[PDB]
Amino acid sequence: SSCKRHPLYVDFSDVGWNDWIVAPPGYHAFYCHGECPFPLADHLNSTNHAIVQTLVNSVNSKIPKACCVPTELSAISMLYLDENEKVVLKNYQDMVVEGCGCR
Amino acid sequence: KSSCKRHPLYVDFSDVGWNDWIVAPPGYHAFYCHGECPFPLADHLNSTNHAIVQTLVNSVNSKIPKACCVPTELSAISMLYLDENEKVVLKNYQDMVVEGCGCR
Amino acid sequence: TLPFLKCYCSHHCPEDAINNTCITNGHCFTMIEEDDQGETTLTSGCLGLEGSDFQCRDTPIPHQRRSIECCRTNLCNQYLQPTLP
Amino acid sequence: TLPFLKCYCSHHCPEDAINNTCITNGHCFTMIEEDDQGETTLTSGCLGLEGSDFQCRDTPIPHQRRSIECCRTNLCNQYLQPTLPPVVIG
Numbered sequence A: 001s002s003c004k005r006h007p008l009y010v011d012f013s014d015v016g017w018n019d020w021i022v023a024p025p026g027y028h029a030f031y032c033h034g035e036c037p038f039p040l041a042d043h044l045n046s047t048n049h050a051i052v053q054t055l056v057n058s059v060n061s062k063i064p065k066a067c068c069v070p071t072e073l074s075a076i077s078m079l080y081l082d083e084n085e086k087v088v089l090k091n092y093q094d095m096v097v098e099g100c101g102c103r
Numbered sequence B: 001k002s003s004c005k006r007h008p009l010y011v012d013f014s015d016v017g018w019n020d021w022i023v024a025p026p027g028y029h030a031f032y033c034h035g036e037c038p039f040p041l042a043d044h045l046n047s048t049n050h051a052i053v054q055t056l057v058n059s060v061n062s063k064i065p066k067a068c069c070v071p072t073e074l075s076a077i078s079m080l081y082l083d084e085n086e087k088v089v090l091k092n093y094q095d096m097v098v099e100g101c102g103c104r
Numbered sequence C: 001t002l003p004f005l006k007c008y009c010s011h012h013c014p015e016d017a018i019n020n021t022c023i024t025n026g027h028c029f030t031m032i033e034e035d036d037q038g039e040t041t042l043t044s045g046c047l048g049l050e051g052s053d054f055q056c057r058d059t060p061i062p063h064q065r066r067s068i069e070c071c072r073t074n075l076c077n078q079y080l081q082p083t084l085p
Numbered sequence D: 001t002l003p004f005l006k007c008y009c010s011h012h013c014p015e016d017a018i019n020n021t022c023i024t025n026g027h028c029f030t031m032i033e034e035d036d037q038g039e040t041t042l043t044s045g046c047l048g049l050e051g052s053d054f055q056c057r058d059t060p061i062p063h064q065r066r067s068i069e070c071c072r073t074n075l076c077n078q079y080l081q082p083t084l085p086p087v088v089i090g
């Protein structure tokens, strides 16, 4: 079962952050997971390295396969509390998986 | 329990069997990335916000995987190869060598 | 460079494949793979252009043997049928 | 931001740490955690600026009891002594 994006919602209340994050109450973060087989198909955006490494793996088992990771990521905004406790608006980069590939 | 880091890996173009379409070099140090991404993800693992959140979630929900140790900085090498009509072309290959690893 | 080429895909389809078809700027592939105890199985899909040369070149010795062939014409891979050396 | 902060590091040292210190643009940390045999371990190191909000805070409820503390002055993590949260529980 090959590398792809899966759902993940992170509810701030569930992980106990609800008391410094004023908003949003949570968000869709997604994650990446699954095999990086050979050959690496186009929709895995693999790097030359991930590809070389994948071939090396089939011939030397001691060398791990490419891993399935975020490959494009988007930001989100939050309202949180300063080290000194009080409403602050920050843009958090690389919070949301847009796409996954083998790297 | 050993941490995400770069490891040596030499690639002999002969072991992998390109001895005949690739004419130069015979191999190159390609390196690779391996190891745990534990909590917390220290500074030198160049983690994204995502990866850090994911590690935090994994620690409360085992069903969510840990972040993965992968190359966060790659560099180029040039090769000489014999192309379809037995031509000798010099060509620059991007993302061939791991210069740095991180949790992602 | 933009996707311009259509390929059949059978175990390596993108989630959003269309009629068991993928599009790419690289090459179509078709692969034959033996496993550890007998059963041999067939694969096909699209290879990205970057690193296409290392995937469309023929290896000498993995764990169990396999072969792979590429071509660059629409739907060209149902016409490929690779065999083990 | 350039790194401007020097910290001690214990199991989370960068592979090029010298004298068990590391540098960063975030905070220094010290954490105590428990392993499955009850053995605890002190770790310490540098946290990047990005995501330090999440890491310094933690979740109150991980699978393994732990406690992380952060501070932001040179070598400050020498003075941090995190302790396990009480197993308080029914």
Ligand SMILES: [Cl-]
Residues within 6 Å of the ligand: A069, A070, A071, A103, B070, B071, B072, B104
């Ligand atoms: Cl990456």
